[PDB]
Ligand binder design. Structure first.
Ligand SMILES: N[C@@H](CC(=O)N1CCN(C(c2ccc(F)cc2)c2ccc(F)cc2)CC1)C(=O)N1Cc2ccccc2C1
Ligand SMILES: N[C@@H](CC(=O)N1CCN(C(c2ccc(F)cc2)c2ccc(F)cc2)CC1)C(=O)N1Cc2ccccc2C1
Ligand code: NA
Ligand code: NA
Lengths: 839, 841
């Protein structure tokens, strides 16, 4: 078995190779359609049933388009829908929101719509805009020129929402406080006086209507205020609009510094980072009550807080995970977690729990007594788990047919170790607790009796409720659509099933692709964005319908294509998915890129690309030619490339994910090496003497653990933005997988590569560290403090900084440098002949 | 000519080598005696004339010793003085750690001491505590260690900058939270004089200090103090007295704030620093005075704080920096050396205490006090000089006793006239000023200027008198001679000289040739101590007795008296370099050092490592012992590298025109000279392989290392750059504005001098650039390195990077230095010297 050595190109030549092979990927890296919305025409003469609206990128900016859904289709041919443009057209906190949401594309990111009026409302650039289409005013046949919402506000306006109750009114966040503006009457009004804009963030820590760093980064909740969907009518012929909102106080939260992007300044931004073990923000609910007269003039605003403290009414709650209003607008719901994230609660909150904010004790005491004792929080649902709660967006409340009962669908891993849908009915008891006594409530005084718990789905697979996945209820046919892994962990698919008499699960998407679906609000259409290992992504429209004899049974017909596939890329040879039975008692899946132009008898250098943390699955049946293109390029340059989804990865169950609880970094490489050896025993072109490992973020963490724990196997490790020290990562993430540092002294020690710098190799040209200098998430100090201890230990390293980058690489020049450095580093210290001589 | 390749040792092996060769230098890295002071015994029957006191390091802390100077010696033998400990054994803050960076102090212990002659009172800081002992006053001389006496305090924070009052040795003063305090060491009365700073407030809110030198003055002007005691005390009719303290008050409200990484990396926090970058404002500065009334037994009756009658901007037109300050011997006037922004216009200015009026906010009482001071009471510019190059600040400034009321007489040094720094006796007549304050107008550009009655040149020629880094002048007023250090005999050797300041001409050398010297004269001008060395012989401290022939006091003769510190004797594993010189096409002889590779093979050619500084204020090449400091240059020679060092133009100890060569033009002229001298060595010695040359330096050295890779990528294969200034706009005022001027008047100079701007001009080949930097560097902020990497990333150029996260501008932590040396040797091996390095292309 003679070793294959990779051709030794210069730095300039490799750049030209990377340039050339990336030259025809301009069209490939531009956003496919999203935020789909179906709206009916209601024109019995016209040829179109629906108009669909969607954000898309036609190198362009991201904007609203529309397309026409026909009443009928010529089934001989394949219809491709034409994209009509709907429209005709960063700060610090805008940049950070884009980092927390991981938004890469510039342009309009989202939009509210009001059905009754046809009003779009969207932020675009600095300004907020609004146009009507599809309501009373009908349907434009050409681009619309949008209307700028005017403002007296000096600073940037974030998080704009239409009022569902009255589309003339909108709300937004300005300088950490809630404002409202009327787009007809031009009336602006500040609803909250919490944050003084002029004061320092060290002095003034309170905000209102905003989600703090932890909730944005680890719970994907970006908004922190919620319009009440209905308006209560006054005797005056006016109305009351309500807004529930979170109010954070970050006074006791640690203040870290992060380098400012303006390197010119040599300055540092202040952040509130609650590191693991430290205080989270002190939270509470508030409600602004807004009285409007019979033609949109604000009579009065009354800001109102909870009758008792949050710590009393919601015992043991740390994070407000999700919140909103029930469809009727009667109750305010909230999904709530404890500190350890092992106990979830869904709680209804009557508006009568809130009372006027009054610093005077006489009036405050009279208001506390004026609210009845019967008015109480209602914990309609609770669950626990030995592993942890995975927050998701699935939660549907039904119409309230009885005063004393509520009915809803929620999802959970806590019964079976697999996320499934459950229809639940909770009795709303008058609480045992009485506020009159001047005592504090018992820990199960607000808990509702559970009348019904029908499991809608069940099995060795999961329903998806994150990254856009959710459910869609059809209340007429009493069905529910959802995405799942039932057919395979390697393929996401759309399914439907009755929530009444839950029988079999009818699959709707065709096997052999993975699907990202979305159902028309009128439950008569769905759009699938799908791909597979060989075929690029493509977005297609499918019409739903039922047999006359049984409306439960749904079937689908292809209607039209929204986005056509690009077709197979000339250079790109995709990888083969493989699986092997582990000694751990689990099937682990892998991907293998065989070297291109495979020589008989020879063995090749091997790059293990890895993420291996939670909330991620690299190995599945989607097209990897866009995102992991350079793994194919590595194959063309002679490297074997391996990717293995170890234990802890998602889409395999909660027990699979919980494998590394308290044990992070300790088990993941054992699976990687097992997968790497399964291939070596079954393919003799894998040179195990020359194996490299590389990854970003958690992948970078495991790259260090690989070279630390198993230097015998891995020759080189290239670690990108790694946590080298778990004590400087946030509460929300770390405490979920690792607990409090006092209750896991050994897990934290063993999981922190900075505490174990003595175990790194004393040969050079093995460790390479990459990091964004401006990283606010995996703060650079992870790399800087590891380097401090590597220097104490007398160990060698190589360092590459990206001074204009935060956690992700956004600037193309930076990404070009990275890809070029990585390719050259592997050539020089793994692949080439010079690399072998070097030892 | 076949190429020699260096033994390709492993990382673990090279650490062993560097560890083994470091091992037997425990004694070598220890501080020799310094801050010497002679005190007479005045004992007819006693065998000793003087007792010397000095700071020294007997891996010990720096502490006070004394030795006994005999009345006579046996001239057959060589007397070694015994080191007697003055002190008995004892029972870092942020501001200390910065001061040590500003003063460049490596060693631990007692840094300095004050001494009151009349009482024997020492005063010295050691740790946070401030201590005193008595020895050599009326009380007498101890034969045993003394117990250090802690000055007790009610101050919470570190007391910095203690100074003994020369008028009363019971009173001391110190800075505490940027304000001046005084404490009596007998009565224990402590007191706060200035109420300017609020310790509990953030520096962003409150940046007014009192009695402290701001960042630029400490870093660039080597003034580490902002208050000065008046040396005599005015007596009151009460029976007690007035003491006075001149002090600089600063206001850094308008100065830009940058953020430097905190050393505690765990916090992930940064500290706020007032860094006046080139272009931006320096602090608003002024003189103030604290008038301290004491009664008959040492109680403070009262304290009056006083300010200038008119603002500093009016009274001292043009003045940015207060460079030096203090009082005249009698205490009649306070003096001050004052520069303009461009640092091309120096002024010496006498300031009467009667210029200061009590501080008042009430406009009624304030206006009455302005009228009560006479119009004759005025600033007095006693000396002014200008220059097309710049003004190098120095400590040489001696005022004589004042006989005629209207006149004042002094010695001062200057490069401005001759082009080289020489001494000048000057007499100045003190006019009542033309400007009159009662008028209400403002003074014109030179209404305070004094008639120059005399300007005798005590020295002259193509060589400089030294007045920096501990060099100064001693003045025998009886015999009317002035002692000084200089380069008259050679630029490569410093020597002690003496000359008359009445009838100058002949300049008698006192130190022996063939060595460079660091000398120090007794206050009674009858002894001198020289710390001397040369390229071959380690440094050595000896005591010499001065004397004259009966007939002629001018004729000064020395005689060896005793050894204070004996030479360690040549280190067995050390070969010193050869000094060389060559005629440059610039019209200047440039010198250099040359370490040949050990066991030199005939016929084979060797890889070459040019080591560099090359900026102003320093000379690397001279006849001093380079065996301790530049030891690893020899370690490179032993591995089979040539090592070259050349002092290019703009260097040091060669006059102001030589230094001025790179005015407005930094980066541009230096690498020419380095390459010329390197090409000179190649044309003469054929063991120098020019196809494998590397450059390396720290700070300005690293700056030029980058420039050399940038400008001359044909000559230099690799370049290792340590803590470089990549971008001149980010460096401070006092330094940049001096050599490069304001950036508005010199865009092209800055552009060409800033490597970050010219990132495109770096090579596209990897394994050539290596950047090193202290991550906590407060002077050459890490941003220089980070922003350079920004544009190297943009340009798609490769680099190697090494960070030392515990270090500021110096490398203090031993583990950090060990790693730097290991990485440097291994980088040079794998990318320049070794065989595998050759195959790598
Ligand atoms: N707050 C978490 C969050 C998290 O762990 N996440 C999984 C990764 N995920 C992105 C992703 C990255 C790489 C990949 F290959 C696949 C997905 C992603 C997903 C969707 C999307 F649209 C854009 C990006 C975001 C959420 C964190 O940042 N660290 C970074 C880090 C680094 C070291 C150790 C622990 C952690 C923990
Ligand atoms: N503020 C100045 C100050 C200055 O220019 N100085 C000359 C150097 N000098 C030290 C020195 C360093 C290296 C060497 F080889 C010899 C001496 C020294 C002197 C006495 C001592 F005890 C210990 C060290 C201190 C004063 C500056 O720091 N930079 C750093 C820097 C870096 C790049 C470009 C310009 C400058 C300008
Ligand atoms: Na997020
Ligand atoms: Na200094």
């Amino acid at each position: 078995l003679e070793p294959f050595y990779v051709e030794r190109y210069s730095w300039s030549q490799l750049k030209k190779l990377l340039a050339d092979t990336r030259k025809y990927h301009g069209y490939m890296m531009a956003k496919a359609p999203h935020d789909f919305m179906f709206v009916k025409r209601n024109d019995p003469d016209g040829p179109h049933s629906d108009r669909i609206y969607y954000l898309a990128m036609s190198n362009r900016e991201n904007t609203l388009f529309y397309s026409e859904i026909p009443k009928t289709i010529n089934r001989a041919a394949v219809l491709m829908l034409s994209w009509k443009p709907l429209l005709d057209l960063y700060s610090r906190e805008e940049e950070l929101l884009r980092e927390r949401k991981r938004i890469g594309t510039v342009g309009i990111a989202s939009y509210d719509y009001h059905q009754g009026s046809g009003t779009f409302l969207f932020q675009a650039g600095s300004g907020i805009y609004h146009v009507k289409d599809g309501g009373p005013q009908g349907f434009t046949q050409q681009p619309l020129r949008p209307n700028l919402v005017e403002t007296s506000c000096p600073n940037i306006r974030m998080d704009p929402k239409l009022c569902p109750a009255d589309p003339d009114w909108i709300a937004f966040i300005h300088s950490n406080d809630i404002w409202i503006s009327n787009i007809v009457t031009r009336e602006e009004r500040r609803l909250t006086y919490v944050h003084n804009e002029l004061a320092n963030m060290e002095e003034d820590a309170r905000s209102a209507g905003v989600a703090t760093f932890v909730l944005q980064e680890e719970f994907d909740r970006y908004s922190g205020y919620w319009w009440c969907p209905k308006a209560e009518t006054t005797p005056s012929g006016g109305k009351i609009l309500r807004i529930l909102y979170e109010e954070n106080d970050e006074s006791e939260v640690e203040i870290i510094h992060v380098t400012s992007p303006m390197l010119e300044t040599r300055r540092a931004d202040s952040f509130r980072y609650p590191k693991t073990g430290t205080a989270n923000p002190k939270v509470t609910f508030k409600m602004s009550e807004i009285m409007i007269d019979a033609e949109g003039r604000i009579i009065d605003v009354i800001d109102k807080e909870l009758i008792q403290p949050f710590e009393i009414l919601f015992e043991g709650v740390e994070y407000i995970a999700r919140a909103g209003w029930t469809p009727e607008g009667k109750y305010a719901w909230s999904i709530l977690l404890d500190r350890s994230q092992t106990r979830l609660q869904i709680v209804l909150i009557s508006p009568e729990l809130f009372i006027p904010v009054e610093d005077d004790v006489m009036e405050r005491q009279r208001l506390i007594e004026s609210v009845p004792d019967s008015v109480t929080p209602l914990i309609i649902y609770e669950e626990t788990t030995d592993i942890w709660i995975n927050i998701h967006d699935i939660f549907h409340v039904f119409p309230q047919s009885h005063e004393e009962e509520i009915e809803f669908i929620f999802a959970s891993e806590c019964k079976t170790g697999f996320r499934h849908l459950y229809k639940i009915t909770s009795i709303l008891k008058e609480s045992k607790y009485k506020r009159s006594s001047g005592g504090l409530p018992a820990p199960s005084d607000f808990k509702c009796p559970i009348k019904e718990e029908i499991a809608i789905t069940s099995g060795e697979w999961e329903v998806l409720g994150r990254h856009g996945s959710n459910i869609q209820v059809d209340e007429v046919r009493r069905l529910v659509y959802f995405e799942g892994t039932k057919d395979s962990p390697l393929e996401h698919h759309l399914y439907v099933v009755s929530y009444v008499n839950p029988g079999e699960v009818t699959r709707l998407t065709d096997r052999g692709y993975s699907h990202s679906c979305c159902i028309s609000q009128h439950c008569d259409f769905f759009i699938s964005k799908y791909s597979n290992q060989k075929n690029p992504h493509c977005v297609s429209l499918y019409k739903l319908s039922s047999p006359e004899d049984d409306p439960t049974c749904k079937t689908k017909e292809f209607w039209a294509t929204i986005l056509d596939s690009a077709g197979p890329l000339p250079d790109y040879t995709p990888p083969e998915i493989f699986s092997f039975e582990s000694t751990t008692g689990f099937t682990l899946y892998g991907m293998l890129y065989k070297p291109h132009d495979l020589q008989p008898g020879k063995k090749y250098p091997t790059v293990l690309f890895i993420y291996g943390g939670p909330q991620v699955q690299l190995v599945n049946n989607r097209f990897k030619g866009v995102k992991y293109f350079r793994l194919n390029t590595l194959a063309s340059l002679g490297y074997v490339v391996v990717v293995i989804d170890n234990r802890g990865s998602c889409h395999r169950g909660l027990k699979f994910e919980g494998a590394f609880k308290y044990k992070m970094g300790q088990i993941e490489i054992d699976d990687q090496v097992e997968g790497l050896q399964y291939l070596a025993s079954r393919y003799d072109f894998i040179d195990l003497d020359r194996v490299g490992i590389h990854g970003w973020s958690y992948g970078g963490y495991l790259s260090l653990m690989a070279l630390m724990q198993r230097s015998d196997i891995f020759r080189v490790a290239i670690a990108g933005a790694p946590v080298t020290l778990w004590i400087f990562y946030d509460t929300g993430y770390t405490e979920r997988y690792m607990g409090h540092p006092d209750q896991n002294e050994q897990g934290y020690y063993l999981g922190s590569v900075a505490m174990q710098a003595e175990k790194f190799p004393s040969e050079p040209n093995r460790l390479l560290l990459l990091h964004g200098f401006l990283d606010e998430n995996v703060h650079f100090a992870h790399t800087s403090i590891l380097l401090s201890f590597l220097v104490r230990a007398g160990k060698p390293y190589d360092l590459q900084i990206y001074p204009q980058e935060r956690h992700s690489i956004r600037v193309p020049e930076s990404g070009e440098h990275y890809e070029l450095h990585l390719l050259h580093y592997l050539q020089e210290n793994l692949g080439s002949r010079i690399a072998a001589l070097k030892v």
